[PDB]
Design a protein around this ligand. Sequence first.
Ligand SMILES: Nc1ncnc2c1ncn2[C@@H]1O[C@H](COP(=O)(O)OP(=O)(O)OP(=O)(O)O)[C@@H](O)[C@H]1O
Ligand SMILES: [Mg+2]
Length: 503
Amino acid sequence: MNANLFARLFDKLDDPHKLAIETAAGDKISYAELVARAGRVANVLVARGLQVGDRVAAQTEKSVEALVLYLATVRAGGVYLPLNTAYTLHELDYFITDAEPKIVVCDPSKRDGIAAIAAKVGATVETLGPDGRGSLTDAAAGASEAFATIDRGADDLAAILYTSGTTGRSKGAMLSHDNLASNSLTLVDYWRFTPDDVLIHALPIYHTHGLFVASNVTLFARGSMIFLPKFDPDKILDLMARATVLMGVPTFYTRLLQSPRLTKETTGHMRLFISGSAPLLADTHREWSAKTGHAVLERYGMTETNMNTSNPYDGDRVPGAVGPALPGVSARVTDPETGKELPRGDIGMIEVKGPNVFKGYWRMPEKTKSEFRDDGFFITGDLGKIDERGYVHILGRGKDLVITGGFNVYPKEIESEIDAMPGVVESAVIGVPHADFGEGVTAFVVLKREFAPSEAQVLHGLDGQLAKFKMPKKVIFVDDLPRNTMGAVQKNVLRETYKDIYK
Ligand SMILES: Nc1ncnc2c1ncn2[C@@H]1O[C@H](COP(=O)(O)OP(=O)(O)OP(=O)(O)O)[C@@H](O)[C@H]1O
Ligand SMILES: [Mg+2]
């Protein structure tokens, strides 16, 4: 009856000695051992001033100790607030001032600088390094394992995750215990996770994917994970011989496809490859199936909504689509302006509703109101369509739409045309200010080493395929596209760098 996520996970534990986590060093941690670790750390949090509802902010390198801190925070009735490991002291100041955590956990090498920030809000600072050592660990070594998991209701907060910051300054999403439990429980069934599953976990844990989807699904299912610090293709390829699931982002798949070790034989023990967090291109899906014989399962979620849709485990996994709405989740497509639902197949704003959807943005009630329809649907900001079979197709972010000379131009279809050309690795299409057209469609293209065409050849190639209003006004060759630490393209970086090209 306790809705606390920790209690949902562990209050009844039938097989306590089963493996939960293998660390990168090869240490093995049982379910019972994980629970006990979380008990010690929960007691530390209370000993360091945690009261129910208080935020615990964590910026640390990835380790099992860092995962335990998440579980312990939730267990103790706190609100877990992970922060991108790369955020500078200056950047952290915004998040700590916004969230006003009671406790901040950071890397030992940054304690002095973070202590000064923490002082502004009266927070206590503990440390945890990449080896799992630090003041938090010292405090936990003498703490009691026994901890009475705090009573929480379905709608009480478990975490605040800040969005990735792709379209603007990151916003804090308030996530409840039921948001997290309902979503992972649904996914366990939908993806047929069992106690026999072994997940290769190579994702960051400050993002919803690596933190909630990977960890909560595995732990509810009573499977295990192999907990790697970063993406390493050869290590991942090595582990596939003794694992069953990989959760990845599209860049995992494009990079693994460059390895000559990626074969049917190397992947033959694997049950399931999942992709999320950015668009898996249909060509990449097909390349994966051609090389390995596996059909990648793509799913779509956001910080604010957890997972909304998924390609079916036991049905057609459709290249370029993110699947139908998950059980319990409603998805529709609406006219961006009027908000009325569109006929199936028409392009508009994707909206979602369900127990997965967050409670709003932290201390931003006005912005929260503006992103919810009157009937409770959340406006995703993603444009797309739902086909006759109910599969959602994401055509792009609303923020990426380019208005030029009175026309709406959808960059994905221009990017598709360019990426189809021989000698092209990938492209990003944006608008930047243009005195004649409002915005000028501009294509940034990453070329292959040998087979590369010129600016003019690209435009000539597009001229035959594309209506005149959709044509890029210029093509710019770049060495790579800017991406965040999760692998998502950062089009605002290109918009800033190239803002004056038509001036
Ligand atoms: N499978 C997918 N296919 C296409 N787009 C995806 C997929 N998964 C995630 N996305 C995109 O990523 C977004 C969610 O990313 P996240 O919550 O990490 O922050 P962000 O939207 O990148 O940053 P911010 O909200 O701060 O601008 C989605 O709204 C969508 O635009
Ligand atoms: Mg977003």
